[PDB]
Design an enzyme around this catalytic site. Structure first.
Site, short mmCIF file in Angstrom:
data_model
loop_
_atom_site.label_atom_id
_atom_site.label_comp_id
_atom_site.label_asym_id
_atom_site.label_seq_id
_atom_site.Cartn_x
_atom_site.Cartn_y
_atom_site.Cartn_z
N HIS A 105 10.64 9.44 -6.32
CA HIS A 105 11.25 8.38 -5.49
C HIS A 105 12.08 7.35 -6.29
O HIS A 105 12.36 6.25 -5.80
CB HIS A 105 10.15 7.72 -4.65
CG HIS A 105 9.04 7.13 -5.47
ND1 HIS A 105 7.92 7.83 -5.94
CD2 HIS A 105 9.01 5.86 -5.95
CE1 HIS A 105 7.22 6.94 -6.67
NE2 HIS A 105 7.86 5.76 -6.69
N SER B 247 5.89 2.54 -12.98
CA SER B 247 5.52 3.74 -12.25
C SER B 247 5.86 4.99 -13.06
O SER B 247 6.70 4.94 -13.96
CB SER B 247 6.25 3.72 -10.93
OG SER B 247 5.89 4.77 -10.08
N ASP C 46 5.38 13.79 -4.67
CA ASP C 46 6.32 12.88 -5.34
C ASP C 46 6.47 13.10 -6.86
O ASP C 46 6.90 12.20 -7.56
CB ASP C 46 6.05 11.41 -4.98
CG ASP C 46 5.86 11.21 -3.48
OD1 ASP C 46 6.72 11.68 -2.71
OD2 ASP C 46 4.86 10.58 -3.08
#
Lengths: 52, 151, 151
Positions: free
Chosen positions: B29, B103, B51
């Site tokens: 993402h 992330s 993801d």
């Protein structure tokens, strides 16, 4: 014969569309996972490998 | 103890790719690649359920991969913003540790090997639970707290 | 150890609700709700075969929920009125501890996690035993000794 041969050709295309969708929905975890290996039986079914 | 095993992506604060086992892996993402010369050449898989983007490690980097395990005993683990507690089957950290753009980070076993990758967090009381991916019994799956935010 | 995970209901002798795991959980034979602002908003499932009312946690409270387990060896456990003994499959107390209005209170494992909730008490001379609810084999059950009175 033209409309029939076109719809049938599109339908064998949609059937080959399982390689575009069903193959990935089964196999992608075995492509994502670190260091793991796919079971030999499934490796033949999805035509994916010579070994691992 | 060492924490250097990530590589960043884009000239922006937008997360990192981990060099794990046989593969580079990254959160899907987020975008803009070229903060390393191998992200410029690697052909990536991806899948919408989990993801990840994944690619096999290149011939020159083979020796440098971080070790990993599927094992997750209860208790304390490490990541780049310090100690993290895995209990009730969920990872947790104090709120304000971690952020958007932090992330694709690993979670480490105290024996020096990866057990999950961070994807996001929740704010259901000020001791944030994490959205993560992990490889339970040698298959990847995603854990996602209710109302969690992708980082 | 702390009882602070309890939240009371109503300006009456009536009882409390417990923030446990993923849910608010409460005794069904008692009423009045709104001493606390989350009991006002939540929608409750209920069952007169177990005497629970329960609702899944609101997205600001899950950090404050008490931990839980199904594990219940023979021995001593804790609640608001001190020590409580689990033996012969019963939970049991010193006679004259507990009263009407002290149902809906959790019983803690010595490791600081919930194993049952109180409903009421049976008494035979100096012998006192509790009606309680608990989650043996991952699914709720009720225990109820002979002649027990709800609190």
């Amino acid at each position: 014969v033209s409309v029939a041969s076109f719809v049938l050709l599109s339908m064998v295309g949609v059937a080959v569309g399982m390689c575009m969708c069903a193959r990935r929905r089964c196999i992608t975890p075995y492509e994502l996972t670190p260091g793991a290996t796919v079971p030999f039986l499934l490796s033949l079914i999805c035509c994916i490998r010579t070994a691992k | 103890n060492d924490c250097i095993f990530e590589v960043k992506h884009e000239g922006k604060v937008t997360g990192y790719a981990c060099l794990v086992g046989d593969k580079v892996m990254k959160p899907a993402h987020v975008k803009g690649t070229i903060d390393n010369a191998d992200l410029a050449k690697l052909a990536f898989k991806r899948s919408s359920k989990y993801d990840l983007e994944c690619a096999q490690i290149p011939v020159h980097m083979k020796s440098d991969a971080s070790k990993f395990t599927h094992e997750k005993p209860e208790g304390y683990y490490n990541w780049h913003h310090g100690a993290v507690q895995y209990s009730g089957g969920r990872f947790t950290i104090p709120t304000g540790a971690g952020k958007p753009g932090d992330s694709g980070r690993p979670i480490f076993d105290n024996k020096g090997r990866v057990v999950a990758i961070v994807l996001g967090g929740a704010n259901e009381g000020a001791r944030t639970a994490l959205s993560v991916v992990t490889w339970n019994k040698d298959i990847v799956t995603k854990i996602t707290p209710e109302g969690a935010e992708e980082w």
